[PDB]
């Protein structure tokens, strides 16, 4: 768990992403998608972009970049009491979608490079330890609801 001053700063941090929530999220999905190709296979609707430069030009792209971040800041404001949110994707991703709990710790690598890239210099070491550890608890607990679904890989 993360004490209240890790929360305040993770919430702190958020308030960044939420000024320009479309930005961030696209940048999230490019880095995610050019540094691990396999992840672009288990989206249909993004498995024709080829070049970055394409990437870039979704309008489509922004849009799911929109959903992800605004899903993930509502289960950050709980403050680790996410169980309620958590579920649904749990079970489908461990059943539907068989996505690895590695795309997971893929994407939240990726949240922390676009911090940096987009602001440098006002990403703290302090926010930075904060945001991994609200990051890796988001991870973990997935990682149990796996475990007693047998998703194995
Ligand atoms: C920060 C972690 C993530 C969050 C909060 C998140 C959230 C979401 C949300 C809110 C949806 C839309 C639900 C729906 O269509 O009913 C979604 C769909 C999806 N996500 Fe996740 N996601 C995350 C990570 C990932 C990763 C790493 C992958 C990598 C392969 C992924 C693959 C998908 C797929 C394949 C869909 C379905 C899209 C479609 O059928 O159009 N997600 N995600």
Do not use: C
Not at 96 to 113: G, M, R, T
Not at 118 to 138: I, V
Request: charged letters at 25%; proline letters at 3%; a neutral charge.
């Amino acid at each position: 768990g993360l004490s209240d001053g890790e929360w305040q700063q993770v919430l702190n941090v958020w308030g960044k992403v939420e000024a320009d929530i479309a930005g961030h999220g696209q940048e999230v999905l490019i880095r995610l998608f050019t540094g691990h190709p396999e992840t672009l296979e288990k989206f249909d609707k993004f498995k024709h972009l080829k070049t970055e430069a394409e990437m870039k030009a979704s309008e489509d792209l922004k849009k799911h970049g929109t959903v992800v971040l605004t899903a993930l800041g509502g289960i950050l404001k709980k403050k680790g009491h996410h169980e309620a949110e958590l579920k649904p994707l749990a079970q489908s991703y461990a059943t539907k979608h068989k996505i690895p709990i590695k795309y997971l710790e893929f994407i939240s690598d990726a949240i922390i490079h676009v911090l940096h890239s987009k602001h440098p210099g006002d990403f703290g070491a302090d926010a930075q330890g904060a945001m991994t550890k609200a990051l890796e608890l988001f991870r973990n607990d997935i990682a149990a609801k796996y475990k007693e679904l047998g998703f194995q890989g």
